[PDB]
Every structure is written in structure tokens, then in C-alpha cells.
Design a protein around this ligand. Structure first.
Ligand code: HEM
Ligand SMILES: [C-]#N
Length: 154
């Protein structure tokens, strides 16, 4: 599938607002994922002991992790689909080290959309949410293809 330049600009205009405070956005997204789909938290050996949103918010390691996740996603989005080099290591790690199914990438996509919709109504109206959904769908389609190449059913 392929996004138009106008769709990419809607993605990158909301991402510019994430980048005012990537750490706070990462906390909100990870907490939303873990609350909405608690089974995902069991994939994190470092974090699966956290019992409450307050503990999650207070975890410095979780905050640093969210910064890495959103910075990797932002680098992918800034490639506007030309993200083969960035996806290779991400897909190998997520298939073979972490064992993250596509369904769980769908859950984090939903958490990203939920947090952006909540924080950024000025840059996340219906057209912008549709563009971000297309971008995340493209990311998941290309990860799924790489999973299959790597031998992981996902
Ligand atoms: C937008 C989708 C995602 C992106 C861009 C992403 C990106 C990353 C990155 C960059 C790291 C490495 C951080 C480091 O250098 O230490 C990481 C680690 C990890 N990811 Fe993801 N990830 C995504 C989705 C998920 C999901 C949905 C799960 C689980 C449900 C997951 C599970 C993990 C695990 C278990 C680690 C290792 C964490 C640790 O070192 O303690 N990822 N991810
Ligand atoms: C990956 N979190």
C-alpha cells in the first residue's frame, strides 16, 4: 500500500508535537497498551512485575524504554515508507528475541492512536487519524512480511 505525500505530512505534523516531550508520550502509550491489553505486559521481562499505573509512571526504566520505542517509530515514519533498513533489525528482534505477534503490534497501534487523539486534537482530527492509521498499517504489513521471511508466524 502507499501513502500520499499529503498523508505523510499529516503523520509528521502530529509527530512534531510528540517530539515536544517524547518521554511523556511514551509513558502514556505504554501504560495505555498495558491497561487495555494486559497480556502484552507479560512479554516484558523487565516490566511485567509492575502492578499499577502509578508504578508504571514512576519507573525510570520504563520511561527510558518508551523514549527508545517512539524514537525508533519516528525514524521509520520520517522515511515515509522507505524504511527497509530500519525494519530489518526491528523485525528480527521482535520476531526472534521478543516473540511479538502482529496482533500485539495492532494493540500498540491502537494505543498510539488513542494517546494522540487525547493529547493532540489540534493535529489529530479525522483526516490526520486516518493518515496515521495508514502509516501504522503499512508498518505492520511490512513487519509481517519480514516476520514471514524470518520464519516467524506472528
Ligand atoms: C510501534 C511498535 C514498536 C516499536 C517501534 C518497537 C520498538 C522497540 C525498540 C526500539 C526496542 C529496543 C529498546 C532498546 O534499545 O533497549 C524494543 C524492545 C522491546 N520491545 Fe518493542 N516495539 C514495538 C512494539 C512492541 C510490542 C507491541 C511489544 C510487546 C507487546 C514489544 C516488546 C518489546 C520487548 C519485550 C522489548 C525489550 C524491552 C527490554 O529491553 O526490556 N514491542 N522495541
Ligand atoms: C517495545 N516496546
Amino acid at each position: 500500500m502507499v501513502l500520499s505525500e499529503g498523508e505523510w505530512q499529516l503523520v509528521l505534523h502530529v509527530w512534531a508535537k510528540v517530539e515536544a516531550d517524547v518521554a511523556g508520550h511514551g509513558q502514556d502509550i505504554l501504560i495505555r497498551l498495558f491497561k487495555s491489553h494486559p497480556e502484552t505486559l507479560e512479554k516484558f521481562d523487565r516490566f511485567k512485575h509492575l502492578k499499577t499505573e502509578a508504578e508504571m509512571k514512576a519507573s525510570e526504566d520504563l520511561k527510558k524504554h518508551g523514549v527508545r520505542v517512539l524514537t525508533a517509530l519516528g525514524a521509520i515514519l520520517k522515511k515515509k515508507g522507505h524504511h527497509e533498513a530500519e525494519l530489518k533489525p526491528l523485525a528480527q528482534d521482535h520476531a526472534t528475541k521478543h516473540k511479538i505477534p502482529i496482533k500485539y503490534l495492532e494493540f500498540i497501534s491502537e494505543a498510539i492512536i488513542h494517546v494522540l487523539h487525547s493529547r493532540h486534537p489540534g493535529n489529530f482530527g479525522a483526516d490526520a487519524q486516518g493518515a496515521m492509521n495508514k502509516a501504522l498499517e503499512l508498518f505492520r504489513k511490512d513487519i509481517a512480511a519480514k516476520y514471514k521471511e524470518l520464519g516467524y508466524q506472528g
